[PDB]
Design a protein around this ligand. Structure first.
Ligand SMILES: C[C@@H]1O[C@H](O)[C@@H](O)[C@H](O)[C@@H]1O
Lengths: 314, 308
């Protein structure tokens, strides 16, 4: 079965690591961090890895139940919540995943909305349940962030109106802050089972192996609750590529596919890239920053090549 | 002739095309009195997006634009006038043959979400809970402007890039006018909506619409509101990619349990992009979690579906 990519322009793609549209293609050859994100990880023959799942609505989302309000040193009102799988089934800690699928894969203060729909209904209200929602922050670097153990903590500005023992949903929206004290680092993984524990079942790190090459990212800018900053999240492949590769499950015929970024209105190749078996792109570029390219552009599979293939410089 | 196909995705791998939600259940309601003419999640079987439908899951019920003025509510809350652009930031051209900017909500209600702003050497930011009343006389996205309200009283900046991220509904009480089949007046109350995706309905006796249903969060109050889409967003995205020619007006599809290979039920998938089934009851369809629709063959309007 022939390998293919979807025909989607950048303006038709979304981030696989946070629910955002793709804004720009991006390189950073001088990146010092090990790149080992866990969302947006899929092999070219369609094997999801890390914490990756198919739903755009599942990325950095949680489902579970608040247990009780808890004490915490930091500002705000804090709440412990057990987490289940996104489909509501109990998360089985013995499953070979780093954490429940969809769990955030970076250090930071993730800002969003906690909402609740009570289990118990009221006869006088037409047998309908009570609801509430509030802004919330999940600090993924916190010792209380233990999604692999089945529970996490979130903070609210709201001081009281969060109910114990009721079905709870976290909808991600952005970051609370990127001040130094908020520990945003998109390449630093959470400790999924808590401080001092080793993460397990990780999707592997990715890196260029060929001289002059660097990773190519699909970049999205992420909203902020407050403060200064223009934070970005870089994914290895957009969510639609994850979904496509999973559907197709085309056999990988080598370790590296040659792909061309094409302007369809002209049919011309803007640049070429290597699409690696483990699901990431490299290009021959020696600068950092956005790739400035016509809006109609998209990647097209050209051929399977090998480790010795030399890319045309961008 | 390129063979027609549907993606192989279970219900638990699908999302709603009318609000950013996972699909929870398949659902029927034969006694529905309303005309069903939603504008998001509309796509013909040969891949033509219609209504306000666009491809991004992040675009559904989202807005992009800039705040122009603050107006205080007579009672409580603060309202903000927002000019809206296309989701890609280009100016919305009201003369384009669309009902409203693509992604615009397609129902009456108080849509709850978050407004965020990143100012035009690091930029200042703010975000707040916000509500967009799509039934409001000030909801005129086809004219390039809408209004949203905040509990926040002051900290929303004018002339700065603004994003609305939808989250759920503010309320479904009597005063909140939630009706998933009532279209907004995209240009205001005395103006006719234009360029709409057509209404959908069974045409054969004993049939009813089959919906992909999602439950939508609430900011407060009582309720268990749901949003029903005609096809999930992944089907829209698939049909658009494939652009397979439609060989009749109606495709026969089978809902299959792959683990047994057995057909659980069959359905008509109509050219304009919606399903009907032979069912005479309302409520969820109880089906194994591994189930998904598979194209069987092209049939016609007179085909008799096996009763569910
Ligand atoms: C029914 C009530 O609606 C309000 O908005 C909520 O704040 C309460 O917790 C409760 O659910």
């Amino acid at each position: 079965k022939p390998f293919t990519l979807p025909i989607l322009t950048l303006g038709e793609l979304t981030n696989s690591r946070f629910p955002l549209p793709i804004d720009v293609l991006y390189t950073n050859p001088n990146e010092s961090a090990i790149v080992q994100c866990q969302n947006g990880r899929c092999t070219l023959d369609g094997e999801l890895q890390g914490t990756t799942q198919l739903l755009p609505t599942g990325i950095c989302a949680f489902r579970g139940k608040v247990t009780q309000q808890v004490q915490d040193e930091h500002r705000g009102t804090h709440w412990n919540m057990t987490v289940t799988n996104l489909n509501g089934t109990p998360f089985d800690p013995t499953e070979d995943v780093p954490a429940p699928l969809g769990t955030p894969d970076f250090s930071g203060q993730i800002y969003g909305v906690i909402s609740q729909r009570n289990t118990n209904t009221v006869p006088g209200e037409g047998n309908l349940p009570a609801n509430r929602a509030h802004e919330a922050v999940i600090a993924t670097y916190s010792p209380k962030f233990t999604p692999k153990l089945g529970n996490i903590q979130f903070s609210t500005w709201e001081t009281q109106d969060v109910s114990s023992g009721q079905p709870t949903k976290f909808t991600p929206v952005g970051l609370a802050s990127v001040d130094a004290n908020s520990h945003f680092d998109q390449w630093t993984l959470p400790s999924y089972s808590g401080a001092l524990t080793l993460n397990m079942n990780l999707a592997p790190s990715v890196a260029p192996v060929f001289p002059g090459e660097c990773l190519l990212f699909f970049r999205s800018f992420i909203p902020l609750k407050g403060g200064y900053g223009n934070p970005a999240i870089d994914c290895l492949m957009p969510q639609e590529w994850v979904q496509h590769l999973y559907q197709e499950s085309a056999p990988s015929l080598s370790d590296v596919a040659l792909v061309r970024y094409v302007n369809p209105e002209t049919g011309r190749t803007l640049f070429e890239a290597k699409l690696h078996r483990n699901g990431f792109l490299t290009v021959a570029r020696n600068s950092a920053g956005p790739v400035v390219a016509p809006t109609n552009g998209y990647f097209r599979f050209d051929s399977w090549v090998n480790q010795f293939y030399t890319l045309a410089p961008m």
